[PDB]
Amino acid sequence: IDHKADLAVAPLAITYVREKVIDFSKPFMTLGISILYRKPNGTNPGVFSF
Amino acid sequence: IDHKADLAVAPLAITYVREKVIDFSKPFMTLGISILYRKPNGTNPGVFSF
Ligand SMILES: CCCCCCCC/C=C\CCCCCCCC(=O)O[C@@H](COC(=O)CCCCCCCCCCCCCCC)COP(=O)([O-])OCC[N+](C)(C)C
């Protein structure tokens, strides 16, 4: 906003508030919110696993 | 291009050639190429499968 730079090549996510002030190009990468979880292990099937 | 319209609210996919001629907004829907395939039909091998 202060013209101390020319581009902003970075993980700068396009949102409502930033678009109202500065201008973005079209997205070079799209994404979202996802879930981390520990990969299953199978070292405990229960004691009546037979 | 002939100014016989004002907007183009439609499934008009942003590509290289169309962007060089007309101007698009930022995407309201993102997508890609995916695969149709028939859902697995269970494969019951009969009731006398033993
Ligand atoms: C482990 C140690 C050994 C113990 C056992 C030793 C004994 C041997 C025991 C059993 C032997 C069985 C023979 C094999 C049959 C093939 C199976 C089949 O595909 O047919 C079908 C079964 O229906 C039938 O079985 C029709 C067979 C015709 C008559 C055979 C028995 C004769 C009767 C007595 C005369 C005997 C002579 C006289 C005796 C005094 C199965 O169909 P499917 O393909 O699985 O799927 C369904 C198909 N569908 C969806 C289209 C409906």
Beta-carbon count within 10 A of B18 CB: 13
Residue with tokens 């520990």: A38
Please give the resolution of this entry in Å, rounded to 1 decimal: 3.5
Our CA dihedral for A7, A10, A14, A20, rounded to 10 degrees, sits at: -40
For B12, the enclosing helix (H) or strand (E) is none
| Nearest CA among A31, A16, A25, A13 for reference residue B19 | A25
Max Cα-Cα span within chain B: 72
Residue with tokens 């990468």: A29
Taking CB atoms and an 8 Å limit, are B27 and A24 in contact across chains? no
PDB experimental method: cryo-EM
* Single-letter code of the amino acid located at B19: E
Cβ A27 vs Cβ B27: under 8 Å: yes
Write out residues with Cβ below 6 Å of ligand 1: B 46, 48-49
Q: Considering only CB atoms, which chain A residues are within 8 Å of B27?
A: 26-27
Rg of the Cα atoms in chain B? 23
